Design an enzyme around this catalytic site. Sequence first.
Site, PDB file in Angstrom:
ATOM      1  CD  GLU A 192      15.304  20.716 -10.639  1.00 35.19           C
ATOM      2  OE1 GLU A 192      16.368  20.219 -11.427  1.00 35.19           O
ATOM      3  OE2 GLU A 192      15.228  21.743 -10.195  1.00 35.19           O
ATOM      4  CB  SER A 221      28.640  17.400  -8.681  1.00 36.99           C
ATOM      5  OG  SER A 221      27.916  18.471  -9.213  1.00 36.99           O
ATOM      6  CG  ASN A 229      24.558  18.390  -7.132  1.00 40.06           C
ATOM      7  OD1 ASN A 229      25.749  17.674  -7.724  1.00 40.06           O
ATOM      8  ND2 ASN A 229      24.817  19.930  -7.350  1.00 40.06           N
ATOM      9  CG  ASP A 287      20.104  23.614   2.484  1.00 38.64           C
ATOM     10  OD1 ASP A 287      19.139  24.463   2.457  1.00 38.64           O
ATOM     11  OD2 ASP A 287      20.870  23.282   1.823  1.00 38.64           O
TER      12      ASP A 287
END
Length: 129
Positions: free
Chosen positions: A35, A50, A59, A101
């Site tokens: 990442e 974004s 994000n 989530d």
Amino acid sequence: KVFGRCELAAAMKRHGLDNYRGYSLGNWVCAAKFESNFNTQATNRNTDGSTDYGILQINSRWWCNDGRTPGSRNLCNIPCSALLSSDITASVNCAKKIVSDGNGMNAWVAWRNRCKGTDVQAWIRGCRL
Ligand code: NA
């Protein structure tokens, strides 16, 4: 700050990421490598306007406020710039909410494409943990 591999592993372990939601420590180190290349100051813009911030490229569409993503959410209740700090506490605490989530670490496109299904334990080999 650009972390060393074992330095990040030790810091992630101390903050409780090892086997968090069943994801072993090597998953998180693998995700950070692809990442951000272990760089807390990494930023990247997405097609929708974004921006992704920090060592885990969190994000602004859902997770932080950067003042330039209108209509977005701030589910970790932080300014996005906090995710760029040399102290990774805010990144780890926000990552714990993301991974919880429903989609697990599939939330991180680089983890799904470059870590999932590989020998992720290799990313912590040699470290005193
Ligand atoms: Na936001």
